[PDB]
Design a protein around this ligand. Sequence first.
Ligand code: NA
Ligand code: NA
Lengths: 410, 411
Amino acid sequence: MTTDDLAFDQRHILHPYTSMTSPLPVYPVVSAEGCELILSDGRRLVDGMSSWWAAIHGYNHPQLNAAMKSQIDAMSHVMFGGITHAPAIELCRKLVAMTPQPLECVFLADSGSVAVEVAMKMALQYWQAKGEARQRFLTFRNGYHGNTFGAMSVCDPNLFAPAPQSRMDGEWDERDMVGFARLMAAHRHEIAAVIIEPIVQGAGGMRMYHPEWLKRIRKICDREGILLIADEIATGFGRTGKLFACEHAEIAPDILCLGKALTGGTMTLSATLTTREVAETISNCFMHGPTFMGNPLACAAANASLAILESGDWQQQVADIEVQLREQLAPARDAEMVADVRVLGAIGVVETTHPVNMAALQKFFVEQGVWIRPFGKLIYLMPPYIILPQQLQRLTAAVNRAVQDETFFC
Amino acid sequence: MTTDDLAFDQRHILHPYTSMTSPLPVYPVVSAEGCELILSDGRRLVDGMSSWWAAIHGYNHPQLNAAMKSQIDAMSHVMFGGITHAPAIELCRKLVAMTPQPLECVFLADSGSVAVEVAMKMALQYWQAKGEARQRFLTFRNGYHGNTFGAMSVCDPENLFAPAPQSRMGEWDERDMVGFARLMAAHRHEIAAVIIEPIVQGAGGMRMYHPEWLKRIRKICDREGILLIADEIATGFGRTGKLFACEHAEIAPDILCLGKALTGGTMTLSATLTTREVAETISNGFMHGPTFMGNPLACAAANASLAILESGDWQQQVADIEVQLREQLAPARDAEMVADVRVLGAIGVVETTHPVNMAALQKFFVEQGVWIRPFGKLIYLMPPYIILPQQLQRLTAAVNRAVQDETFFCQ
Ligand code: NA
Ligand code: NA
């Protein structure tokens, strides 16, 4: 990559959440292996982000590589309309078996937002088939479910209950419920579904709430006849310490959305699983179909990623990561720029009192030989499960150092 | 693929537009090469669909394959936030260079529907930035722009819907404009953008209309200061006989959407291009970012796919496909089940008077050693540009056979 290459990027290529008139530096990566990103100039960086949740087995993993290459030798893509193939079947089997008993019907899609839209369309068609006037969704404030038109309608600015005040680390307080009870009482009759991110509210605040909330929501839904949609696009596949974050409340949703880590972070794929009751009611078809539904290559990558998780090794890896993050992020509770430190599984969050200075903190991080990407008042880690203790220690040392003074804040 | 495997597919895997209470048969594909799909039972089928527009170079293409394998060797994925990489830069260079001059800012995304949602959002953020109350989109009836909620608000039934373009790809009839002008006069103050598929309305009826429509729409938008969104997710990359269908009218939109054939049908990827005016104007007031934005593997596949097109061979491959389709579909105009026949580039459409029987028709095609996937009252062909004449002949003969009587119709 030349500097002329980098100039073209600034002038012509839009990047996520960022100006075309004031783009900040972007770093050129040429390759990646294990837990390291390799920059154009040869510098190797320990990845603390898993490229946004997804790369749980890291990069250039031999099992993912082999599977993707083999699939390419067979066929990279073929349409799913009237057709089926081994990768899609092998994947859907693993998905049905690893999720709660009632979730046995699979709608594969391309992106998470699209998987959420499918979930919403599923809830709307469901009630319409019963002849009921239910077009409204009840969600939490601070929630995040995607970029698209429908996904945006249930995002922190339908009906919005307050964000869950009670914590995963701490105690349950009953006052938390008053707002969601008030909303449901007033609206039980027009509500099609409650859509929520279980335990961890990712993009909306990296909040971790007490599992009693999920227990409570599940019973209220059962009682009123209302559908529950669990958005696990960020939480699935072992990130919070359990395979799926719902397991934390011992509950099953009516509709489950998955993505990000599904393919081991090699390429995009998503899935929306539901119950037979929902799947059959709607057909009495579900009106949906992305062009690349069931992509064999993305399914093959996903199958190999799940096979690595079938060993169970991730449980110990994630538990170890949890203990190391708690121990090593704790000192930050004492720095002047930190407001809160919270860990669950392989998620380590240091919330600050003032917002960060993106360009400056990013450079500091790259200088430390680590890749860490902050947003707002949050400096967080979500590393790959195969990260070595030495590598994890480099990440926490860098975070602890960043919050030592106001050099990198505002 | 065992039978247990096939049974699990039927009871647990949703397929596009198709019931889970009354599922219809599906065919197990184990591999694909050239212009052929290979079933589990060993049967080879000539593909007439390009896996819905996308696989313009067929399957197991040695150049596409080596490119993908090489990128997997470097890295299949890395986040695009704060990071850039060779595959995305090379791709955006090609996209900017091959599209009309004003289109120079690229937003890479995953699926077509998302690319469209991005365009709509751009149009809204834009007027908001200029401080204009503009929240209506004006579109054509019979349009298709994707499956997400925003995309559906401009799919044929609050937005404005002008009558479906009547003049055919045919002489022009000024009366065709009455419905469109009326809406414009009444709501010109409130319209954020006009959004249409150029020349070919795909999923909404495989309709083929007159390029004068684009000249007029471009001129009217110019005059009122309204944004023009051209959805070329289906028509892009040579399909209609020109590189982009907008070329038929030698017009440039303010916003351009691309997908499907962008990667040569190896994996999903999409892109929305717009002008500097739009990108600078939503910037001095863009709120979008899919997780896998800029995915290196998909970008590498698109680079190798665009490199094949760089040779220019598609132009004559498509011209020859068009001559063959017109000649070989002509006999369908003598069949009792046909309502209309129309051809443009490597697209051949036989519209029927009654809806097809999917299960029965699909099986018939498979027995003829061809893969053709109809829908509603349309039996159409969009083959890979590399299809051999003997292969295209097998497709057109199967279509002609299918429309001779009631057999494969209704249900
Ligand atoms: Na299950
Ligand atoms: Na251009």
